[PDB]
Design an enzyme around this catalytic site. Structure first.
Site, PDB file in Angstrom:
ATOM      1  N   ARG A  58       0.838  -1.200   0.000  1.00 42.55           N
ATOM      2  CA  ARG A  58       0.000   0.000   0.000  1.00 42.55           C
ATOM      3  C   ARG A  58       0.870   1.246   0.000  1.00 42.55           C
ATOM      4  NH1 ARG A  58      -3.743   2.703   4.463  1.00 42.55           N
ATOM      5  NH2 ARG A  58      -5.395   3.537   3.015  1.00 42.55           N
ATOM      6  N   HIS A  81       0.309   4.457  -2.505  1.00 43.49           N
ATOM      7  CA  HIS A  81       0.182   5.851  -2.040  1.00 43.49           C
ATOM      8  C   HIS A  81       1.394   6.654  -2.483  1.00 43.49           C
ATOM      9  CE1 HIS A  81      -3.090   5.393   1.256  1.00 43.49           C
ATOM     10  NE2 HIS A  81      -3.491   4.921   0.113  1.00 43.49           N
ATOM     11  N   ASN A 123      -3.314   8.663   4.600  1.00 40.53           N
ATOM     12  CA  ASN A 123      -2.237   8.063   5.357  1.00 40.53           C
ATOM     13  C   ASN A 123      -2.366   8.167   6.872  1.00 40.53           C
ATOM     14  OD1 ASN A 123      -0.669   7.179   3.162  1.00 40.53           O
ATOM     15  ND2 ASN A 123      -0.127   9.334   2.747  1.00 40.53           N
ATOM     16  N   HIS A 159      -6.576  -5.958  -2.109  1.00 44.06           N
ATOM     17  CA  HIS A 159      -7.424  -6.097  -0.934  1.00 44.06           C
ATOM     18  C   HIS A 159      -7.711  -7.566  -0.642  1.00 44.06           C
ATOM     19  CE1 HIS A 159      -8.922  -1.671  -1.302  1.00 44.06           C
ATOM     20  NE2 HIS A 159      -7.637  -1.720  -0.981  1.00 44.06           N
TER      21      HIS A 159
HETATM   22  C1  HEM Z   1      -9.258   1.245  -5.937  1.00 40.73           C
HETATM   23  C2  HEM Z   1      -9.176   2.203  -5.018  1.00 40.73           C
HETATM   24  C3  HEM Z   1      -8.734   1.933  -3.566  1.00 40.73           C
HETATM   25  C4  HEM Z   1      -9.333   2.393  -2.437  1.00 40.73           C
HETATM   26  C5  HEM Z   1     -10.597   3.306  -2.424  1.00 40.73           C
HETATM   27  C6  HEM Z   1      -8.617   1.871  -1.306  1.00 40.73           C
HETATM   28  C7  HEM Z   1      -8.872   2.062   0.019  1.00 40.73           C
HETATM   29  C8  HEM Z   1      -8.299   1.518   1.138  1.00 40.73           C
HETATM   30  C9  HEM Z   1      -8.696   1.673   2.510  1.00 40.73           C
HETATM   31  C10 HEM Z   1      -9.895   2.594   2.858  1.00 40.73           C
HETATM   32  C11 HEM Z   1      -7.998   0.837   3.217  1.00 40.73           C
HETATM   33  C12 HEM Z   1      -8.177   0.685   4.703  1.00 40.73           C
HETATM   34  C13 HEM Z   1      -7.190   1.695   5.460  1.00 40.73           C
HETATM   35  C14 HEM Z   1      -7.257   1.378   6.888  1.00 40.73           C
HETATM   36  O1  HEM Z   1      -8.417   1.414   7.370  1.00 40.73           O
HETATM   37  O2  HEM Z   1      -6.304   1.638   7.677  1.00 40.73           O
HETATM   38  C15 HEM Z   1      -7.133   0.094   2.257  1.00 40.73           C
HETATM   39  C16 HEM Z   1      -6.168  -0.784   2.661  1.00 40.73           C
HETATM   40  C17 HEM Z   1      -5.270  -1.342   1.786  1.00 40.73           C
HETATM   41  N1  HEM Z   1      -5.102  -1.192   0.442  1.00 40.73           N
HETATM   42 FE1  HEM Z   1      -6.411  -0.111  -0.668  1.00 40.73          FE
HETATM   43  N2  HEM Z   1      -7.597   1.096  -1.791  1.00 40.73           N
HETATM   44  C18 HEM Z   1      -7.543   1.194  -3.148  1.00 40.73           C
HETATM   45  C19 HEM Z   1      -6.644   0.626  -4.003  1.00 40.73           C
HETATM   46  C20 HEM Z   1      -5.541  -0.058  -3.565  1.00 40.73           C
HETATM   47  C21 HEM Z   1      -4.406  -0.374  -4.395  1.00 40.73           C
HETATM   48  C22 HEM Z   1      -4.242   0.032  -5.878  1.00 40.73           C
HETATM   49  C23 HEM Z   1      -3.520  -1.080  -3.648  1.00 40.73           C
HETATM   50  C24 HEM Z   1      -2.134  -1.677  -4.008  1.00 40.73           C
HETATM   51  C25 HEM Z   1      -1.924  -2.258  -5.192  1.00 40.73           C
HETATM   52  C26 HEM Z   1      -4.049  -1.162  -2.288  1.00 40.73           C
HETATM   53  C27 HEM Z   1      -3.526  -1.918  -1.277  1.00 40.73           C
HETATM   54  C28 HEM Z   1      -4.098  -1.997  -0.040  1.00 40.73           C
HETATM   55  C29 HEM Z   1      -3.713  -2.868   1.024  1.00 40.73           C
HETATM   56  C30 HEM Z   1      -2.759  -4.062   0.787  1.00 40.73           C
HETATM   57  C31 HEM Z   1      -4.328  -2.445   2.143  1.00 40.73           C
HETATM   58  C32 HEM Z   1      -4.125  -3.035   3.508  1.00 40.73           C
HETATM   59  C33 HEM Z   1      -3.015  -2.179   4.278  1.00 40.73           C
HETATM   60  C34 HEM Z   1      -2.699  -2.666   5.613  1.00 40.73           C
HETATM   61  O3  HEM Z   1      -3.277  -3.637   6.190  1.00 40.73           O
HETATM   62  O4  HEM Z   1      -1.769  -2.080   6.252  1.00 40.73           O
HETATM   63  N3  HEM Z   1      -5.243  -0.490  -2.310  1.00 40.73           N
HETATM   64  N4  HEM Z   1      -7.326   0.566   0.996  1.00 40.73           N
HETATM   65 CA   LIG Z   2       5.038   9.977  -4.468  1.00 37.67          CA
END
Ligand code: HEM
Ligand SMILES: [Ca+2]
Ligand SMILES: [Ca+2]
Ligand SMILES: [Mg+2]
Length: 306
Positions: A39, A43, A71, A170
């Site tokens: 992630r 970002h 973040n 996800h």
């Molecule tokens: C399509 C649009 C996306 C949205 C709206 C989104 C949104 C989010 C949100 C809201 C979280 C939860 C944050 C938390 O509550 O602390 C999350 C977690 C995460 N996202 Fe996404 N995300 C998107 C795309 C992506 C992309 C492109 C990737 C990487 C290729 C990614 C990888 C991850 C991962 C692996 C987590 C888990 C992080 C952790 O457990 O530390 N996301 N995302």
């Molecule tokens: Ca950058």
């Protein structure tokens, strides 16, 4: 200049192995860390390109992206990025950029979790600045419409195929109550929960995330295999088990091209993995600093000489 796969071949030939070993060790005490690291690359790439701008800490002149909305109280693993960088500096002093660390860490984390491998492109240089405001306007939010998330992907150079593939990240990691609790009681002012959330998962989450309770409590993005990198993410959508609005919208939006891409990936993990790898290379190619631009950071938290 172009990024290339063999950028470190003659100077830090063991870089890939060092990154992978370091994250393998980190995984023994934090099964979430692989998810957190990929992630960070997302970002990073979505704001001023893949330039490690996100890793910079606040100074008198730098307003860190760590306090940008997407973040704050969310992004993590910065210490593990530091440990990866220390391992590389020990072996290869002054060689590997922090921007490349995040690209390398993403591939390692996905493969270690049972995901695809891919050929990482390298040669990115690290920014001298951060863009907090751009993080707030450029990174999609889980409660945005499919059309507005699509727009934010297009603005950085990723299409609908890339969006659906990359959303499959996800398949591991965590999310807090606060980023999906709008689905659970009174969805968008309608007085009822989001009807595209399975009623069983709904009741589980209502109890996890009560209205007067803590928004910081976390659950798994993938209830099937929380830490395994697989296509289960997409299968979940087919049974109304996606956690974020932005997840379920991929399958439940009537007349959307994304439905068929979801079903392709749910039906065939090889197709998902091939697409995911290609889309990760696509994302990693967004606006790199090369040549004289940027620097090679010694310490990913700060600019050199500071
Ligand atoms: C399509 C649009 C996306 C949205 C709206 C989104 C949104 C989010 C949100 C809201 C979280 C939860 C944050 C938390 O509550 O602390 C999350 C977690 C995460 N996202 Fe996404 N995300 C998107 C795309 C992506 C992309 C492109 C990737 C990487 C290729 C990614 C990888 C991850 C991962 C692996 C987590 C888990 C992080 C952790 O457990 O530390 N996301 N995302
Ligand atoms: Ca950058
Ligand atoms: Ca999974
Ligand atoms: Mg199922």
């Amino acid at each position: 200049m172009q990024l290339n796969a063999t950028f470190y071949s003659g100077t830090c030939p063991n870089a890939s192995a060092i990154v992978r070993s370091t994250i393998q060790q980190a995984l023994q005490s934090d099964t979430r860390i692989g998810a957190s690291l990929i992630r960070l690359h997302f970002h990073d790439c979505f704001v001023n390109g893949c330039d490690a701008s996100i890793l910079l800490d606040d100074t008198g002149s730098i307003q860190s992206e760590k306090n940008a909305g997407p973040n704050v109280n969310s992004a993590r693993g910065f210490n593990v990025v530091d440990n990866i960088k220390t391992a590389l500096e020990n072996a290869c002093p002054g060689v590997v950029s922090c921007s490349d660390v995040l690209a390398l860490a993403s591939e390692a984390s996905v493969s270690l979790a049972g995901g695809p491998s891919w050929t990482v492109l390298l040669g990115r240089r690290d920014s001298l600045t951060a863009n907090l405001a751009g993080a707030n306007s450029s990174i999609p939010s889980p409660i945005e419409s499919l059309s507005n998330i699509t727009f934010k992907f297009s603005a950085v150079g990723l299409n609908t195929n890339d969006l659906v593939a990359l959303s499959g990240a996800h398949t591991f990691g965590r999310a807090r109550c606060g980023v999906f609790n709008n689905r659970l009681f009174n969805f968008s002012g309608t007085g009822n929960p989001d009807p595209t959330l399975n009623s069983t998962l709904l009741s589980t989450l209502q109890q996890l995330c009560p209205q007067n309770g803590s928004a910081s409590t976390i659950t798994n993005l993938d209830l099937s295999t929380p830490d395994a990198f697989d296509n289960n993410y997409f299968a979940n959508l087919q049974s109304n088990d996606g956690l974020l609005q932005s997840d379920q919208e991929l399958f439940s939006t009537t007349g959307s091209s994304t439905i068929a891409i979801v079903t392709s990936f749910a039906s065939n993990q090889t197709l998902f993995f091939q697409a995911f790898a290609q889309s990760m290379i696509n994302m990693g190619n967004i606006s790199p600093l090369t040549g004289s631009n940027g620097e090679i950071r010694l310490d990913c938290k700060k600019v050199n000489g500071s």
